Design a binder for this molecule. Structure first.
Ligand SMILES: O=C(O)CNC(=O)C(=O)O
Ligand SMILES: [Mg+2]
Ligand code: NI
Ligand SMILES: [Zn+2]
Length: 331
């Protein structure tokens, strides 16, 4: 078995190998990359997402989210308070202000220490889940706005035509902005490209060990657990690496820098934080190997997780018994 210790793998495709997206994902899996839950892909040196970022300041962040924490430094939840709209240029100025900017630090490890020590005492503002793309339309390779769609994959594998569309989302981050422990909707893959700015640190649990994370989460968030049988779908809970280590949960960590892709694999729990002002783009995708994960994916039916139009069809076709109760949650 390849990559039996479930380490995060880093790949360096040539421009020739960067032509066929599906093929390269299958290659990475042939080397065991999926076992980690997360992989890094460094694009060929000749490749670019677009010519410059000089003209992005007038993108609107219609609903910036202030991420307010409750709990203890290593075990907390966050809620998102909606703020007034601002442009990317306004947000970047805010991120660089004395109140919100990255503190002085020695290296990524020192900054990681400061994050876990101090995150709960601040409420950074996140521009998340903004439909759109920063890839130039002429970028032919690994353009996240030109991927094959999950509906087309399901149709190719299973023969059923379904409604729904699949488009990318932009994320504008600042120091301490946080992504809670989650897997993707319907335990899909994701791909994330860091277009610009400061790094993003990731934590991930191997798919084969995901239930160990879930059992810890039920112990650490006991009222949330009683409220919903899949409360990590709410995307609100954080657990530090120190706490994971104290409880024997297998995980790995890596820092993504501007110009790099990350791929998350089906049922790979992940969480993380941004180091400073940055912009990422991400989208879900599927392969044939995903279908079995989609069939088995947990669902939130308490009503909190409330997700896309396109997830309907996935539940209806892959999980017809759940369909009924899940849609009661979504209506
Ligand atoms: O970058 C972020 O804030 C969150 N991204 C992801 O969870 C992803 O790409 O799967
Ligand atoms: Mg603009
Ligand atoms: Ni994700
Ligand atoms: Zn729920």
């Amino acid at each position: 078995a390849q990559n039996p210790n479930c380490n995060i793998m880093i790949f360096h495709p040539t421009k020739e190998e960067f032509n066929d997206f599906d093929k390269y994902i299958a290659y990475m899996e042939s080397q065991g990359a999926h076992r980690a839950g997360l992989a890094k892909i460094i694009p060929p040196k000749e490749w670019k997402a677009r010519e410059t970022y000089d003209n992005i300041s007038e993108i609107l962040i219609a609903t910036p989210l202030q991420q307010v924490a409750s709990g203890r430094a290593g075990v907390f939840t966050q809620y998102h308070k909606k703020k007034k709209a601002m442009t990317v240029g306004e947000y970047r100025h805010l991120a660089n202000s004395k109140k919100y900017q990255t503190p002085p630090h020695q290296n990524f490890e020192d900054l990681e220490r400061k994050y876990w020590k101090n995150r709960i005492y601040n409420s950074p503002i996140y521009g998340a889940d903004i439909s759109g793309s920063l890839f130039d339309e002429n970028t032919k390779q690994w353009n996240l706005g030109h991927l094959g769609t999950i509906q087309d994959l399901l149709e190719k594998e299973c023969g059923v035509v379904i409604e729904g569309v699949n488009t990318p989302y932009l994320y504008f981050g600042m120091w301490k902005t946080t992504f809670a422990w989650h897997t993707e909707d319907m335990d899909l893959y994701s791909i994330n490209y860091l277009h610009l700015g400061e790094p993003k640190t990731w934590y991930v649990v191997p798919p084969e060990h995901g239930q160990r994370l879930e059992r810890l989460a039920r112990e650490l968030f006991p009222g949330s657990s009683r409220g919903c049988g899949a409360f990590l779908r709410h995307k609100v809970a954080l657990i530090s690496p120190t706490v994971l280590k104290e409880n024997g949960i297998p995980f790995n960590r890596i820092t993504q820098e501007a110009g790099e892709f990350m791929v998350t694999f089906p049922y790979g729990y992940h969480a993380g934080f941004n180091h400073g002002f940055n912009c990422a783009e991400a989208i879900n995708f599927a392969t044939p190997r995903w279908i079995d994960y989609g069939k088995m994916a947990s669902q939130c039916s308490c009503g909190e997780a409330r997700v896309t139009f396109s997830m309907d069809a996935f539940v209806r076709i892959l999980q017809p018994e759940r369909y009924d109760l899940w849609k009661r949650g979504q209506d």
